[PDB]
């Protein structure tokens, strides 16, 4: 989900 994206973005920087 979404949620998955921002968490992704979040943790790549």
Do not use: C, P, T
Not at 1 to 13: A, C, E, P, Q, R
């Amino acid at each position: 989900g979404i949620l998955d994206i921002l968490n992704k973005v979040s943790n790549l920087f």
